[PDB]
């Protein structure tokens, strides 16, 4: 099964304040495992999933120092961004970073990731070759030229291919008691009265992990994009997710309708219909 690791970092300034706040969050296979936040009393990286209390005094200490180093890097960059965009002081601003590595089921590097955004928008990103940069904005060509001239790419390429891949392998052995596991959806259909002679069939999928899931309704073979009603997949808040798709139906005709649930955890898709 493939694997991954990410650090999502952010720095935010507001018009009141003297300094921005910097926050970092680490993820293994998309589950949060570490976090740092400059608003805290004692800013430190903290373990975020039972399996990270393993790392000793040295880990947390050394990662914390890196975090205070990122924070200054982010402070100086906001300041520079403000001038690149000719933004007068008096606004809120955001700079965000995503970094890390995807592994194949063989545990080999599949793809490195380095991307940045400023005010919510793509600012500069490391291309998949880990050699060249994409930066769209006129204002960003400055940064892209400083980074090319300074060999930045070859540095991040080293971290993406070496230290990143390595520490993920390590974190992968350390918690091999959860980190592969998928929870399959349990699905059911509920019956709701609606407009005269018409009811709502609402297919629920519940209890599943990871979040990616597809729900579909058919009228004897024909998929209903016609105005189906779904909700965005949502956290149950116990680590599992929920989704539902509903359709309006002729009253009585409610067995020409089947709900299918597609999910990676499943032996095969579920097939479902209202059952009174």
């Amino acid at each position: 099964g493939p694997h991954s690791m990410r650090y999502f970092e952010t720095a935010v300034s507001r018009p009141g304040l003297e300094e921005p706040r910097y926050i970092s969050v680490g993820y293994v296979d998309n589950k949060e495992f570490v976090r740092f936040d400059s608003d805290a009393e004692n800013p430190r990286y903290e373990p975020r999933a039972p399996w990270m209390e393993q790392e000793g005094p040295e880990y947390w200490e050394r990662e914390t120092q890196k975090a205070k180093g990122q924070e200054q890097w982010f402070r100086v960059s906001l300041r520079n961004l403000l001038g690149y965009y000719n933004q007068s002081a008096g606004g809120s601003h955001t700079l965000q970073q995503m970094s890390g590595c995807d592994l194949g089921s063989d545990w080999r590097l599949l793809r490195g990731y380095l991307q940045f955004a400023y005010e919510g928008r793509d600012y500069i990103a490391l291309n998949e070759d880990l050699k060249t940069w994409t930066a769209a904005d006129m204002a960003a060509q400055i940064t892209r030229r400083k980074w090319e001239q300074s060999g930045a790419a070859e540095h991040y390429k080293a971290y993406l291919e070496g230290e990143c891949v390595e520490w993920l392998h390590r974190y992968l052995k350390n918690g091999n008691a959860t980190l592969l596991r998928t929870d399959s959806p349990k699905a059911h259909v509920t019956h709701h009265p609606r407009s005269k002679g018409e009811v709502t069939l609402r297919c629920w999928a519940l209890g599943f992990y990871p979040a990616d899931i597809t729900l579909t309704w058919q009228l004897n073979g024909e998929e209903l994009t016609q105005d189906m009603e779904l909700v965005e997949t949502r956290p149950a808040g116990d680590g599992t997710f929920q989704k539902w798709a509903s359709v309006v139906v002729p009253l009585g005709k409610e067995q020409n309708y089947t709900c299918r649930v597609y999910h990676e955890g499943l032996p095969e898709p579920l097939t479902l219909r209202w059952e009174p």
């Binding site: 990662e63 890196k66 700079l95 970073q97 991040y156 993406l160 990143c164």
Partner: peptide
């Protein structure tokens, strides 16, 4: 363990 950044913006 997370990247440590190089040249600033």
């Amino acid at each position: 363990k997370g990247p440590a950044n190089f040249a600033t913006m």
